[PDB]
Structure formats: C-alpha cells, structure tokens
Paper text:
In this report, we present the structure of the [name]-bearing C-terminal domain of [name] [name] ([name]-CTD) in complex with [name], resolved to 2.4 Å resolution. In order to stabilize the [name]-CTD/[name] complex for structural analysis, fusion of the two domains via a flexible 12-residue synthetic linker was pursued. Crystals contain one dimer of the fusion complex within the asymmetric unit. Although all of the residues of [name] could be constructed from the resulting electron density maps, much of the C-terminal peripheral domain of [name]-CTD, as well as all of the artificial linker, are disordered. The structure reveals that [name] binds to the ends of the hinge-forming arms of [name]'s [name] domain, fixing this hinge at approximately 120°. Unexpectedly, the structure reveals that [name] has a novel zinc binding site not found in the other quinone reductase enzymes with which it shares homology. The metal cation is bound primarily by three [name] residues: H12, H13, and Q37. Further, this zinc forms part of the extensive interface between the two subunits of the Kef system, being also coordinated by a backbone amide group belonging to G536 of [name]. The cofactor for this protein was determined to be FMN by mass spectroscopy, a conclusion that is consistent with the observed electron density in the structure. A binding pocket for GSH between this arm and the rest of the [name] domain suggests that the arm can either be stabilized in the obstructive conformation by a smaller GSH molecule or possibly destabilized by bulkier GSH adducts, modifying in turn the protein interaction interface's potential ability to associate with parts of the membrane domain, which might lead to activation of K+ efflux.
Numbering used by the authors:
A (entry chain A): 400 to 562, 1001 to 1174
B (entry chain B): 400 to 577, 1001 to 1174
The structure:
Amino acid sequence: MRVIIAGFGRFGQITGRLLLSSGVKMVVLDHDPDHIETLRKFGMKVFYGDATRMDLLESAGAAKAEVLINAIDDPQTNLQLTEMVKEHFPHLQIIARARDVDHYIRLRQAGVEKPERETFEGALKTGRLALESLGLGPYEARERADVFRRFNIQMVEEMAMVEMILIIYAHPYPHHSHANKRMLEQARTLEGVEIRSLYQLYPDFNIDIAAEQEALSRADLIVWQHPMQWYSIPPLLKLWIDKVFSHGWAYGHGGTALHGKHLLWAVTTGGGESHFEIGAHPGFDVLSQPLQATAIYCGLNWLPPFAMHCTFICDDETLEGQARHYKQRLLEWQEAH
Amino acid sequence: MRVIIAGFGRFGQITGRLLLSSGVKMVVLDHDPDHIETLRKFGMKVFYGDATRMDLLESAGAAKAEVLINAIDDPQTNLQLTEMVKEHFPHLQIIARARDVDHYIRLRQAGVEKPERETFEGALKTGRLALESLGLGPYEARERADVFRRFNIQMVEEMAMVENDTKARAAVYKRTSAMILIIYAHPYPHHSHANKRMLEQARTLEGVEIRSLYQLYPDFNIDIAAEQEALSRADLIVWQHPMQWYSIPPLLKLWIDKVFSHGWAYGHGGTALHGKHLLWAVTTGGGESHFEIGAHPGFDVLSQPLQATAIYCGLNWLPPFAMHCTFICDDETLEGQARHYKQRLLEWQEAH
Ligand SMILES: Cc1cc2nc3c(=O)[nH]c(=O)nc-3n(C[C@H](O)[C@H](O)[C@H](O)COP(=O)(O)O)c2cc1C
Ligand SMILES: Cc1cc2nc3c(=O)[nH]c(=O)nc-3n(C[C@H](O)[C@H](O)[C@H](O)COP(=O)(O)O)c2cc1C
Ligand SMILES: [Mg+2]
Ligand SMILES: [Zn+2]
Ligand SMILES: [Zn+2]
C-alpha cells in the first residue's frame, strides 16, 4: 500500500521494522541474494531486484504509494534512484540515506528535504559514551551532542546552498487534540498571530534557545497554551522555560528582554472548577502560581488566565463557545495594545 | 592526554569533533593519508599507520589513556584491536563502533559494554521521518522509536548469549517475539552540592534505593514498566530535586505523566500506590523571602500541584522537606540540613 523501501540491509531493515511495528504496509526491494536469505530466516519477505529499474518500482506499486525510502548505500545508485523517482513518480515522497556530506549535498540539490548521513547519529552517540566514561553526566553529554548537531547541520546546509501575538503551544499530541486544536483554529483567523508548537519543533527535547528568543523578541503578547497535566504543565513547556528564560536575557544583569511584554496562560482542563478543591490550597487560580511567579520574576505582565474547563463531559458546542471566547480575549488584548 | 581514537573517517571525525568542543585532549591512529591534513587542521596528534600495531598503540599512550574509541570500520580489524586492548591495557575503557548486529554481538561477547551499531540511530531517524510524512506527529513518532529501540536492544542482548549462527539467533528472535525509593531528578547530578550531600546522607540508611532519572533517561525515554516495578517494592516514595522556576525538573514531570498511568495509579483499578507514602524533598536557592512573589506568595503554596497529584493517586502526602538558602549557604547549614533529611527518613521507617 503506502511505502516502498529500496535497500534492505542494515539501514533499510531498521527503518522497515520500525514501520512494521506501527502496522504500516510496505514493499521491499533488495539486490543482494545473501541479505534476502538471512531475512527469510527471520521471517522478513524481501523482493529481489535493482530498485533503479522503473518497471520493478512500478510493479511494487510506486504509482499508488505515498513514501519511498531510499536506503541504497552506493551514492551514485542512490542518486540515480532519486532522480528517476522524481521524474516518473512525482507524487512520491522521497526519504533518503546519505553516505557522507558530499552525498547529502547532492541529495539536497536534488530536492530531498532531510538526508540522513548514515553514520552521523551513531558517531554522535559514541561521543556521548566517551564523554560519560570520562565523567560527564549522561544528560550533559546529550545536551552537548544536541548543540554540536545543530551547529553541524547549519554548516552542512550552508555548504549545500553554496554548492503581535506569539502562542507557545505545548500539547504533546497536537493531532489528537479536540479542545486546543479548536482554540488554535480560532486564533489563526486573526493577524498577526504566530504559533510555535513545541512538540512538533522539538520531539527529541532539544530546544533551540536562540530561535525561541528571536521569536519572543518580536512578540508583544506571549501565550502559554497547553492542556493541563497533573495540575500543571507538559514536560516540554517546563523545559522551554528552564532553557529559554536564560541569564542574563530573561533575568539578572541585564537581562531585560521580556520587560513590558504581556503573558497569558491559556489552559484546558479535563475536570471542572470543582475538581480542584483538593489539598492544602484548593482552587484553580492557585495552580497559576509557579507560572505567574516565573513571568513576574522575568519582568512580564501577567494577564488573567483563559481557562476552558470541563472538556471531559460536555456539549460539543461549548468546545466552540469557549474556543471563540479565546479569540475574543486575544482580539480584546490587541484592540487595547 | 586522555583519549585515543582509532580510525578517523566519517565516524571518527564526528566523534572526535564532538570531543574537541568539550576540550577533550586526544590522540588519533589512522592509516589513510587523506586524513593527515584534517588532523593537522585541528592541531591533533596523529600516529600514521595500522592501529592494530602494538608499537603505535604504545606510542599513542595506550598505557596512560582513560578511553579508547575504536572507530575502525572493518569488523575483523575492529575486533582484533579490541582483543589487543582487552589483553594488554585492562585499565583502558573501550568504546566501540559496530558495523551491524553480528559485529555488535561479538564485541559484547568480548566484554565491550555498549557497542554502537553505526547506522542504527540514523535508520531510526529515517523511520521517524517516514512515519511523520504518513501523518504521525513528530513526538508520537519519536516515542514509537523509543519503544522499538528498547525491545530491539533486549532482543539483541538475548541473541548474544547463544551460539554464533543465524539459526540459533533466528530461533531466539522467534521465541522472544512470541523501604524507601528516592526518585532523584537533578539534571546535573555531578554539579550538585546540596542534593549530592542529601544523597550522601540518605545512603547510610537501609533499605534505600535511589533512581537518578537524568542518569537513567538522558533522552527522556522513560521505561514505565521498570519504574512501576521499583515503586511496587517501595513503602516511602521521595521526589527529590532542586527547585526550578517555582516548580520541578522537566524529566520529573515526564515521569509523573508517564509512570502514573491509567489504571495502575488512578482509575479502575487502579490502586497500585494506595497506602504508600510520598515525601517532597526539595532544595531552593532563595530563602523564604524569595517566595514573596505573585498573587499566592509563600513557599508552601508551591507544593499544591504535587500534593493534589499524590492525593488523586491515593498516596499519603507527608510534610515537605525543604532546604532553603543554597544561594548563600554556610556549609554548616548545608551539612545541618542534609543530616535533618536523613533524620526525617529514619523517623519515617522507625514509624513503619
Ligand atoms: C497525562 C494527563 C494528565 C492530566 N491531568 C489533568 C489534571 O491534572 N486536571 C485536569 O483537569 N485534566 C487533566 N488531564 C486532562 C486534560 O487536561 C484534557 O484532556 C485536555 O485539556 C483536553 O484538551 P485537548 O482536547 O486539546 O486534548 C490530563 C490528561 C493527561 C493526558
Ligand atoms: C533553571 C533553574 C531554575 C531555578 N529556579 C529557582 C527558583 O524558582 N527558586 C529558587 O529558590 N531557586 C531556583 N533555582 C536554584 C536551585 O534551586 C538551587 O541552585 C539548587 O536547589 C541547588 O541545589 P544543588 O546544589 O543540588 O544544585 C533555579 C536554578 C536553575 C538551574
Ligand atoms: Mg539498507
Ligand atoms: Zn500528534
Ligand atoms: Zn552532571
């Protein structure tokens, strides 16, 4: 049905087994009879053939497939496949393996968005392990790898080339969202709203601080929009705060990037207001305290929260009632600023 | 001074380049003349020649180094160097590139702890991109890759314990695919002063188990079953961490979201934590006046999301332990507060 995989050695095998674990249907071509053999032994069925033959690709279902995984090792063959596919199967999304930088560059120029250098992440992981056995903590080693990865990709993208409302959205599952999605649909029908969805930008929890601080600089209203999770916020939003509100950008000497900007907490909850009469300091507004303190410390003005309660039990029309009041609040804020 | 890298091609150059940024001092063995100029550019000492030569290895400082990175591509050569080092330089920690699962298994059998299959994490990123373009969210896709990584490593670990033929391995593949607990969540445990002393104290008691989340899950891929198993044995659960923006570390929040599952911790039914106790043990830079901020001021208010979480899951919330003033702290206050932490734990178990 949806995926063709060209090459089913070390690289292709892993990519295909991940997709199988998600119940994705695929057809696999390999031109190595020994690899096909070893795979038969482990219950994987792979078809024999050179994937640069458009007749083979065509019978594998290329005209109807969504994604082709180019996992061929040889740069020139890998590149031939790429060019042939975009000429004969232009609807087909190409995801490609790259042997090295030279190969990655040729793939970028061919129009592949994100070529994966075959040894890059493994070599990065090896570096982390070496740092660890030298005594760095595992987490700090991983942050250093994240910093190097961002620098190296930017460098390599450059080589390839050479040849106001800011909503910080922090739903972990934006595609599964009912309440927050409706809120965003409504907020989009204003100008000039920018939305930064953290879990789409940073699935590996590697905040790009410079990019985030740049967006915040162009914002007059910042919004923390998220579903409530355990009387609190999602892990990535907490990470965003800890990293982006840096010394001395958000606080200290000096430190004043956020001064005079406003902040709004826009939160959705499963339970209704009565669900929060628990513990030593009951009530919904008490839950804002860490966030409000955070904002005030960094020189932000804290607006009264937008809270959409009772998303568990409802009419599927307060989902749009309360969603419109969200837009109302944003529009209100800006007609005054 | 500290690191030897054997092989400086695509794999060795990335690894060595990461280490430069960390100011690590290294020496490199490599037998390709096309890399000599790249090594010179970085100012790195190179021994040109076959890295399996005992003389080059000795010249490179093998007897003195802490770490050897085996970034040789050819599996036999890689394995040869590994055995050489295991035999003659037993102090030397080996980090090894593995070509594939067969090479990985043989390195494991040779005593290498975590060989890194060279294409594995990259093939996993490619699979994630495939899933995204088929409509999965990036994050949900990353989580699927975490589940797959965990099971894959477990599977390959069991294949390593059996004989080196495909039939023996394919058989294993087919069969397999068919009391105080301190939850410590400082992101930088080695840089800790206050929490480190707290743990130094707590470790003098028994039976205390410590799970350092940032040592265990630097990639924020929580093993829910392992965490739930450890909780099953605990009578007192401690969330121990430094305060970060009036709240908790991101990884502790992920641990709650993931480990307090439906219905293990709440729902039907849903009662695994019922009857257990919870202590919040937190450290703060500021003193009590530091919390005179916002509409609901005062340190105590801040325990609210934690207390409500605990109550909801049927845990028994204890008065928090807090160590304030770490910003400007007499080591006698730090010594004194660490001891009081131990005191509090001891008094809980004398009571239970
Ligand atoms: C991990 C988890 C923890 C949650 N904790 C709370 C809670 O503390 N209080 C609450 O009212 N809702 C809680 N919820 C429910 C969500 O807030 C609710 O489903 C969400 O706001 C719905 O918005 P959505 O349609 O955009 O997903 C939790 C949900 C999950 C996934
Ligand atoms: C990102 C970050 C946020 C912090 N937020 C607070 C805070 O809200 N209140 C406070 O008193 N200290 C805060 N601190 C200080 C730490 O709580 C304090 O340095 C830590 O508890 C010291 O313990 P340690 O020696 O174990 O690292 C913060 C520190 C960092 C790194
Ligand atoms: Mg392949
Ligand atoms: Zn999603
Ligand atoms: Zn550390």
